[PDB]
């Protein structure tokens, strides 16, 4: 059991930017944390590649 004051623990978040070479981009929230969604096509393996990240 952990008792703590609000100021005990800090969380920092920075949503990555979607660069100029990324086809698809968006943003989603996970409990108030803005995520970066990014899709890329893999011609070699004939399929898409998604990535949410923060």
């Amino acid at each position: 059991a952990y008792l703590w004051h609000r100021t005990a623990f800090i969380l920092a978040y920075r949503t990555p930017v979607v660069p100029e070479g990324a086809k698809a981009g968006a943003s989603f929230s996970a409990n108030g944390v803005a995520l970066r969604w990014l899709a890329d096509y893999d011609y070699s393996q004939l399929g898409d590649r998604t990535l949410l990240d923060v």
């Binding site: 920075r14 949503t15 990555p16 930017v17 660069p19 100029e20 990240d53």
Partner: protein, 55 residues
């Protein structure tokens, strides 16, 4: 050509018309390439126009 006037032999040296040439080739590829990780682009780039494109 020149020959002596009233020369007993009457042969003429025929001149040649040779056209010359030289080739111009497209043979070089000048480039500037930049690689930015997602951290570098997210946190270290501020403008990307006066910080990446202009350089």
């Amino acid at each position: 050509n020149r020959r002596d006037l009233r020369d007993p032999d009457r042969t003429v040296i025929a001149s040649e018309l040779v056209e010359h040439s030289f080739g111009v080739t497209l043979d070089k590829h000048v480039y500037a390439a930049l690689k930015f990780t997602d951290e570098q682009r997210t946190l270290d780039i501020r403008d990307y126009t006066k910080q990446v494109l202009m350089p």
